[PDB]
Design a protein around this ligand. Structure first.
Ligand SMILES: C[As](C)(=O)[O-]
Ligand SMILES: C[As](C)(=O)[O-]
Ligand SMILES: [Ca+2]
Ligand SMILES: [Ca+2]
Ligand code: NA
Ligand code: NA
Length: 341
């Protein structure tokens, strides 16, 4: 029958590049698309094609050739001619960034999105659950979210991850707390409050053999550990810091919160095993373990058939709502170290 609440604004629902192999699915947010192509692809004249909300139009039209050396804007107008939305569409044609100083974020947003740059060119957007937290109605400003930027880093600014209450609305959804996280991948806001573990899509293509994840942290557990909203006395919160490498396929384009450590597609895992509460910047250097009966194939590697994810969280079991509100993980000067070829 007739739609109950018409969604007003019209969306780009998909993106593809006819005749170019994308290295992973385009990452679509409310007002942005990131398209990934192999290093060496000519990006001076790409012609993205979109699907849209029925009855919408897009300007310039779907299939217009443009120069994506810089991001290009499109406007979608709803059928009614009143509602419009601007999207920024960017093409990433470089290999994954591996040096993270947490200085750079996207301006003009209601919460922080950390990016990696080469000069003025953005080459990666980190993801978090921020889009999901916005849906609880709790945050007022960028600093109220679980994932934000803090001025006092080890050098310059740093990443700050704080486990937050999700308030009344979060509790009625069975989601009473929100861990601060940051990861390589994307956040699918359509699952944020229906299948939250499916919302965190971990990994992007990586064409080297990672050997160590290194960097610095500080950590303070929150005062009162809770399990599904219920206080528990014997427990102190702890952070998690980890990285995974897995082989992609038609059936496994990404891993997520349901299978980050268990998917048979995993080839390698690095993970902190001596995390502690500390107010001093503490070095970690996590070796990647290649898993039993797995191997990194050279030709798959060069073809881009493996993804790597790096994940930080202020509450190790926060993804299952076990954690302490106020748990705070600061991260700075991280490096993904890989073998020289
Ligand atoms: C960061 As947005 C307004 O494209 O979801
Ligand atoms: C109705 As409008 C502000 O999306 O042009
Ligand atoms: Ca608008
Ligand atoms: Ca820094
Ligand atoms: Na919309
Ligand atoms: Na960087």
């Amino acid at each position: 029958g007739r739609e109950e609440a018409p969604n007003a604004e019209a969306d780009i629902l998909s993106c593809r590049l006819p005749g170019v192999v994308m290295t992973t699915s385009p990452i679509i947010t409310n007002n942005s698309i990131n398209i990934f192509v192999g290093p060496g692809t000519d990006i001076s004249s790409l012609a993205p094609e979109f699907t849209l909300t029925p009855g919408a139009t897009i300007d310039p039209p779907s299939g217009t050739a443009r120069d994506f050396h810089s991001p290009q804007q499109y406007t979608v107008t709803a059928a009614d001619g009143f509602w419009k939305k601007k999207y920024t569409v960017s093409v990433i044609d470089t290999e994954l960034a591996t040096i993270y100083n947490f200085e750079d974020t996207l301006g003009g947003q209601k919460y922080y999105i950390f990016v990696e740059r080469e000069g003025e060119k953005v080459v990666m957007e980190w993801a978090s659950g921020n889009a999901g937290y916005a849906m609880t109605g709790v945050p007022k400003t960028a600093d109220d979210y679980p994932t934000f930027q803090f001025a006092n880093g080890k050098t310059g600014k740093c990443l700050s991850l704080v486990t937050r209450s999700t308030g009344f609305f979060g509790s009625i959804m069975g989601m009473p707390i929100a861990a601060g996280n940051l990861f390589i991948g994307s956040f699918d806001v359509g699952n944020a409050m229906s299948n939250p573990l499916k919302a965190t899509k971990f990994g992007l293509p990586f064409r080297h053999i990672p050997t160590y994840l290194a960097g610095y942290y500080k950590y303070k557990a929150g005062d009162q550990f809770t399990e599904g909203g219920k206080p528990v006395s014997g427990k102190r919160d702890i952070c998690d810091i980890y990285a995974i490498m897995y082989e992609t396929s038609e059936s496994v384009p990404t891993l997520d919160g349901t299978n980050a450590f268990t998917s048979p597609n995993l080839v390698s895992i690095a993970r902190i095993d001596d995390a502690k509460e500390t107010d001093e910047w503490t070095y970690f250097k996590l070796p990647f373990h290649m898993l039993s009966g797995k191997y990194i194939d050279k030709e798959k590697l060069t073809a881009g058939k493996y993804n790597v994810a790096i994940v930080f969280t202020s509450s190790l079991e926060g993804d299952h709502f076990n954690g302490a509100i106020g748990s705070t993980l600061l991260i700075d000067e991280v490096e993904l170290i890989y073998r020289s070829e």
